[PDB]
Amino acid sequence: DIIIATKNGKVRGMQLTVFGGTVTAFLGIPYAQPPLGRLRFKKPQSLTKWSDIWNATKYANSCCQNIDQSFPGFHGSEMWNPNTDLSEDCLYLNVWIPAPKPKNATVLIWIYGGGFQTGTSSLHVYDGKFLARVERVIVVSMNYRVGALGFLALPGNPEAPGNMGLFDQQLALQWVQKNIAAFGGNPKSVTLFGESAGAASVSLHLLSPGSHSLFTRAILQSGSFNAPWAVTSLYEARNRTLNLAKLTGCSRENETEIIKCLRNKDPQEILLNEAFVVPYGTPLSVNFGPTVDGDFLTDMPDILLELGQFKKTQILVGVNKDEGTAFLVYGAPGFSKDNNSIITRKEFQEGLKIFFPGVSEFGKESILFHYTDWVDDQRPENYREALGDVVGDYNFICPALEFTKKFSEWGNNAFFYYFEHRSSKLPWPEWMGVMHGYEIEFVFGLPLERRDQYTKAEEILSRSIVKRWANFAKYGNPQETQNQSTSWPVFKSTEQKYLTLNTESTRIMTKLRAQQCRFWTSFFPKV
Numbered sequence: 001d002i003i004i005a006t007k008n009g010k011v012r013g014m015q016l017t018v019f020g021g022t023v024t025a026f027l028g029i030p031y032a033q034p035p036l037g038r039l040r041f042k043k044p045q046s047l048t049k050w051s052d053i054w055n056a057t058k059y060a061n062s063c064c065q066n067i068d069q070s071f072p073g074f075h076g077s078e079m080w081n082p083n084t085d086l087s088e089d090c091l092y093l094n095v096w097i098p099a100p101k102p103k104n105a106t107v108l109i110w111i112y113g114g115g116f117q118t119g120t121s122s123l124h125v126y127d128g129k130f131l132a133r134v135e136r137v138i139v140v141s142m143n144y145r146v147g148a149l150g151f152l153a154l155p156g157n158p159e160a161p162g163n164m165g166l167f168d169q170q171l172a173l174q175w176v177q178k179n180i181a182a183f184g185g186n187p188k189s190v191t192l193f194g195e196s197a198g199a200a201s202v203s204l205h206l207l208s209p210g211s212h213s214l215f216t217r218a219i220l221q222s223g224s225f226n227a228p229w230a231v232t233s234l235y236e237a238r239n240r241t242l243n244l245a246k247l248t249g250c251s252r253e254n255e256t257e258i259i260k261c262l263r264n265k266d267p268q269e270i271l272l273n274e275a276f277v278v279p280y281g282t283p284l285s286v287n288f289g290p291t292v293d294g295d296f297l298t299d300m301p302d303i304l305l306e307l308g309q310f311k312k313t314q315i316l317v318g319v320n321k322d323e324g325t326a327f328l329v330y331g332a333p334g335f336s337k338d339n340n341s342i343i344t345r346k347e348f349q350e351g352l353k354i355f356f357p358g359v360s361e362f363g364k365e366s367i368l369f370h371y372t373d374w375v376d377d378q379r380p381e382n383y384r385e386a387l388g389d390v391v392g393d394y395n396f397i398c399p400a401l402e403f404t405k406k407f408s409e410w411g412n413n414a415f416f417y418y419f420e421h422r423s424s425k426l427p428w429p430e431w432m433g434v435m436h437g438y439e440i441e442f443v444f445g446l447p448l449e450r451r452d453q454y455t456k457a458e459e460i461l462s463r464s465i466v467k468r469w470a471n472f473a474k475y476g477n478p479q480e481t482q483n484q485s486t487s488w489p490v491f492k493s494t495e496q497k498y499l500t501l502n503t504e505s506t507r508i509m510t511k512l513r514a515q516q517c518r519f520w521t522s523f524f525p526k527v
């Protein structure tokens, strides 16, 4: 039995055997008052002390959210769906610490993705016990509100100010600052890491002054705030809030009575209307996400980035080779996870209309022009891969590169990676390649489990990534120094060196997606 006294009371954990050693897991520690009743849509309130022993013995409830039901029974989609009960009572976090209790361990704080609409800390690919066992770090992960319950926004209105999910995260980071030393963690050695919307959340904490003092360093996998899906303007956020009130029959003149009415609706009626606050949506629709609230975000974030107004520290940023393929089977015509999805020129044009609905004909033609100059017009998969790269380059790769250029320009060390290994256990078909979200299991060291049917070369790769992530956390330098590994150079805006991650050859390259990103970053914003 192992019990830790926290500032709010005692918590009991559990012992796990990992690789012939022991990890202590505290699953489901509350870090806030449950945001129920009159607390729905408001910022999280600070937890009141308890005097019992909280049994942190099971993952807690996941936050309310819609579920991907497009491929029932298919592990490739269902592995991302919540694996605990849905509840508005969901503000809880998990702690994995090595056994024996370390003395001053670097802490790694995971923020999950899911488009700000979905996600939960309890997923199998976010299990921090391997990192705790192997690198002797402490891993913290938290649930935070998503969807309209997490990001409904009426400007300057404390009944629904926006960004509550980001404030959920920030109160967890605070909890770590006040409590993790009881668990043997170093509150001065805290690294945030996240993927997708989680990565965008990490980039926004670097911009939020209230988060400056709650962490040391940041890791951003496949995501950043300047991605086109990541931040909503105060305009549309208020328009979407009011469209939701119409749909639920909550339209009122006094905007506070609107929220009060919305607080008496059942979570399911809110959830089943989120998708319609927008006239035309896409597979990448983020109907309720971060806004410039004037609180978490004190100005438009593109301006803060550009003028150097952010936490000065090291970053580790990266993307996957086929970021965009996952979304093609969620609407684009001619695509299937069950066939090779060879599409025609006409199908590719219709695909752009799905993914760029509110764009001019000239804007959509400009995409087609830049992506259909073929090395061989007789290759039958030209259009299939073009649309994948279009969605990937626009939504993930080019924003990530541009974040890294702009952040490094202010003097901080930056490190960029290009993950190009396709999991040998990946359930999706091969044309989808190195998919969005499928470096996570390597970062968390699941292929270090010999029982789980990865290849030996996948064990070696995960091992080396895990050491690089941990050295970055502890020391700000993502090297693997013992096993002749390729040195990871810093990313400067001049030379733009990045490192490729794969089972074969780890390589230094320059200027990833150079031509593609000059289009997305310096032409397409004008259309």
Ligand SMILES: *[C@@H]1O[C@H](CO[C@@H]2O[C@@H](C)[C@@H](O)[C@@H](O)[C@@H]2O)[C@@H](O[C@@H]2O[C@H](CO)[C@@H](O)[C@H](O)[C@H]2NC(C)=O)[C@H](O)[C@H]1NC(C)=O
Binding pocket: 103, 104, 186, 188, 189, 190, 216, 474
């Ligand atoms: C635990 O370690 C810290 C120092 O952590 C290191 O320094 C940080 C700035 C950051 O770079 C981390 O990744 C490093 O691991 C000790 O902090 C010292 O504490 C005293 C009192 O607060 C202060 O006067 C010193 O300046 C701190 N040292 C610093 C800031 O470098 C802390 O005491 C250690 N605690 C235990 C129990 O081992």
Ligand SMILES: *[C@@H]1O[C@H](CO[C@@H]2O[C@@H](C)[C@@H](O)[C@@H](O)[C@@H]2O)[C@@H](O[C@@H]2O[C@H](CO)[C@@H](O)[C@H](O)[C@H]2NC(C)=O)[C@H](O)[C@H]1NC(C)=O
Binding pocket: 239, 242, 243, 244, 246, 247, 276, 277, 278, 279, 280
């Ligand atoms: C701002 O909101 C309006 C209202 O949206 C409509 O009602 C909502 C409840 C929801 O069902 C939306 O999809 C509906 O379209 C947006 O939509 C326009 O609304 C007006 C008035 O109802 C109507 O004339 C148009 O058909 C709607 N469609 C379009 C394409 O304008 C309006 O577009 C929103 N603003 C922006 C910039 O998107």
Ligand SMILES: *[C@@H]1O[C@H](CO[C@@H]2O[C@@H](C)[C@@H](O)[C@@H](O)[C@@H]2O)[C@@H](O[C@@H]2O[C@H](CO)[C@@H](O)[C@H](O)[C@H]2NC(C)=O)[C@H](O)[C@H]1NC(C)=O
Binding pocket: 332, 333, 334, 335, 336, 338, 339, 340, 341, 342
């Ligand atoms: C790949 O499959 C898509 C999707 O069709 C579904 O999955 C198939 C594998 C099969 O089981 C179909 O019955 C399913 O509907 C195909 O796109 C469809 O093509 C048909 C052809 O008659 C067309 O009528 C539908 O509108 C298409 N559905 C869309 C566009 O969403 C596609 O043709 C298949 N391609 C290849 C190369 O096999």
Ligand SMILES: *[C@@H]1O[C@H](CO[C@@H]2O[C@@H](C)[C@@H](O)[C@@H](O)[C@@H]2O)[C@@H](O)[C@H](O)[C@H]1NC(C)=O
Binding pocket: 012, 055
């Ligand atoms: C909290 O935990 C106490 C200790 O019991 C522990 O949990 C049970 C399920 C067994 O695994 C036992 O061996 C453990 O020591 C409980 O006595 C107490 O009732 C628990 N509180 C709850 C479940 O609300």
Ligand SMILES: C[N+](C)(C)CCSSc1ccc([N+](=O)[O-])c(C(=O)O)c1
Binding pocket: 068, 113, 114, 115, 116, 117, 118, 196, 197, 229, 283, 284, 285, 286, 326, 327, 330, 395
């Ligand atoms: C379509 N599918 C059910 C796979 C989305 C999962 S929930 S919606 C959503 C929208 C946009 C993003 N994104 O990254 O841009 C994400 C993400 O993967 O984080 C999620």
Ligand SMILES: C[N+](C)(C)CCSSc1ccc([N+](=O)[O-])c(C(=O)O)c1
Binding pocket: 155, 156, 234, 292, 293, 294, 295, 297, 298, 299
């Ligand atoms: C309706 N009306 C035009 C009054 C909206 C303003 S209300 S929300 C908001 C959003 C962004 C910021 N900011 O940081 O610039 C601030 C601030 O600090 O005043 C406030």
Ligand SMILES: *[C@@H]1O[C@H](CO)[C@@H](O)[C@H](O)[C@H]1NC(C)=O
Binding pocket: 254, 255, 256, 257
């Ligand atoms: C809206 O109603 C609330 C309900 O208590 C009230 O306090 C507030 O003054 C009203 N605001 C406006 C702008 O009418």
Ligand SMILES: *[C@@H]1O[C@H](CO)[C@@H](O)[C@H](O)[C@H]1NC(C)=O
Binding pocket: 463, 464, 467, 480, 482, 483
């Ligand atoms: C380094 O190589 C050894 C064998 O000499 C291997 O067992 C170990 O996993 C490697 N460590 C890292 C961090 O790659």
Ligand code: NA
Binding pocket: 460, 461, 464, 502, 503, 506
């Ligand atoms: Na390797």
